[PDB]
Amino acid sequence: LAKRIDAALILKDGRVVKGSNFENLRDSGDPVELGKFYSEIGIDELSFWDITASVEKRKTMLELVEKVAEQIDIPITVGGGIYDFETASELILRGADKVEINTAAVENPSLITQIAQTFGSQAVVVYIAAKRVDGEFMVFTYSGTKNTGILLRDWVVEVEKRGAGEIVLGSIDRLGTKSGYDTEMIRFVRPLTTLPIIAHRGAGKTEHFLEAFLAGADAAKADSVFHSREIDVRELKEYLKKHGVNVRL
């Protein structure tokens, strides 16, 4: 029940895409060091999202998960182009606490059930990328480019039914913006599911996290707004505690 503050790291070839601004780090593009630093200053969970599109993708993610598991103690999620049970299984066995699937879940929802059947629902995260299209929230796959024709309200119900443990709700209408999380979309989904809802996309300032939790989010995920140091994780948690939000300090 404590509200969660999650940091996500976008990776290509084992490197943090666009780096960070933590001058104090030995390598500002090293996902292991950046992740360990975040765990020290009080991030609650970490996401490693791989956009590597090469024949080396699978082998790279597994070696990264090995290193991260040794040095980092907080929950680790890994995602990005995980397409089948075998890939998911190896990542979990190598040390990932949770695997995140999106396009493969939409195309083959049985995959949700296969993963949860062996590892439990707690190990399955479904990232849902959604966007308003002609007055309706619709689900998008392939890095947000494919309108599947599936309604968000239908897919949320099916994801829980299939056995996912939590849903990351990413508003494509907030991609790259700094104007706030999509609280209308969070409020839309909240009554439809009892699963943990993770808000993603749009965070630009500390008050946006308060808004997301008042909307019913169980966690808030951000990336560049942390890496750029626009928002300090410690200052964010003290702000949220100050204003009545249950965060782990």
Residue numbers in the entry: 2 to 250
From the paper:
Computational design of KE07 involved construction of a theozyme to catalyze the chemical reaction, which was then grafted into the scaffold of imidazole glycerol phosphate synthase (HisF) from Thermotoga maritima. Catalytically essential residues from the initial design include a base (Glu101) that facilitates C−H bond cleavage, an H-bond donor (Lys222) to stabilize the phenoxide intermediate, and a π-stacking residue (Trp50), which was designed to stabilize the transition state and favor substrate binding through interactions with the aromatic ring of the substrate. This initial KE07 design (Round 1; R1) catalyzes the cleavage of 5-nitrobenzisoxazole, with 103-fold rate acceleration over the noncatalyzed reaction and a turnover rate (kcat) of 0.018 s−1.
